[PDB]
């Protein structure tokens, strides 16, 4: 099974006073491990998972230095894009950036990412070949021209295929007690009468990790979809996740219906049946 390291950055201009609001977070898989908040008192990269705390002073100094430099660049970027897009200094705008790498089932490099949005829309993104750029518009095109001339993709490719994968693997080992523990969903079904004639079957998946999961309803062994409802996967707040899927059925016919649960923590898919 695969693993990822991701860094997410949000910069929001504050045209009334001062510098942009800047928030950075780093994830390994679905586990946040670092943060930087411009509005917090420390002004340092801070730990958010026990296993990154093993890292020494030089790591924290180096990660603080890099994230602060990055925040100043986003401040510049906000000014640059406001210029590109002919916008006034009066409104607030958002630059987002995400970068990172996956390792595959063979524990080697699988994919690299490095992409930006402006005011919630795609701006520029490194393609899967880690050699070319997708520029959404003519503003992003001028960024692309600059970056191609400066060999920005080569410098990113080296990080993504090297440092990124190497440190991801380091974290996965140092944090293995949780990072390489799969928490299979804790599943049950509940039953709610809607009328004398129909009832809701709700299939629960609780306390699972990682977040990726599939819940499917069947009737007489065939996928259903009609008269179903499926909430978006949500965080429990303890590092695990929750989801449910529901189906409305004729009362007395509950036994026909099965909930199917797929998750990395489950050797074989689970089947739940009210009966």
């Amino acid at each position: 099974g695969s693993h990822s390291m991701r860094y997410f950055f949000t910069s929001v201009s504050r045209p009334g006073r001062g510098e942009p609001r800047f928030i950075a977070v780093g994830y390994v898989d679905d586990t946040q491990f670092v943060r930087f908040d411009s509005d917090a008192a420390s002004q340092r990269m801070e730990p958010r998972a026990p296993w990154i705390e093993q890292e020494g002073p030089e790591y924290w100094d180096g990660e603080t230095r890099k994230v602060k430099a990055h925040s100043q660049t986003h401040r510049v970027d906000l000014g640059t894009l406001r210029g590109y897009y002919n916008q006034s200094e009066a409104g607030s705008h958002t630059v987002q950036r995400m970068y990172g790498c996956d390792v595959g089932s063979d524990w080697r490099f699988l994919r690299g990412y490095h992409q930006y949005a402006y005011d919630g829309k795609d701006y520029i993104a490194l393609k899967e070949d880690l050699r070319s750029w997708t520029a959404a518009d003519m503003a992003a095109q001028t960024t692309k021209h600059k970056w191609e001339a400066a060999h920005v993709a080569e410098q990113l490719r080296a990080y993504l295929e090297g440092t990124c994968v190497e440190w991801l693997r380091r974290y996965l080992e140092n944090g293995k007690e949780t990072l390489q523990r799969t928490d299979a969903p804790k599943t049950h079904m509940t039953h709610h009468a809607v009328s004398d004639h129909e009832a809701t079957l709700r299939c629960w998946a609780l306390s699972f990790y990682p977040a990726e999961i599939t819940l499917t309803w069947q009737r007489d062994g065939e996928d259903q979809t009609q008269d179903t409802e499926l909430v978006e996967t949500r965080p429990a707040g303890d590092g695990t996740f929750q989801k449910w899927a529901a189906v409305v059925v004729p009362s007395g016919q509950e036994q026909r219906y099965t909930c199917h649960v797929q998750h990395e923590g489950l050797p074989k898919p689970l089947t739940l049946r009210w009966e």
């Binding site: 994230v67 640059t80 930006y116 920005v152 990113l156 990080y159």
Partner: peptide, 9 residues
């Protein structure tokens, strides 16, 4: 571990 290169739009 963050990237070192300081890329600007």
């Amino acid at each position: 571990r963050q990237i070192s290169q300081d890329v600007k739009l």
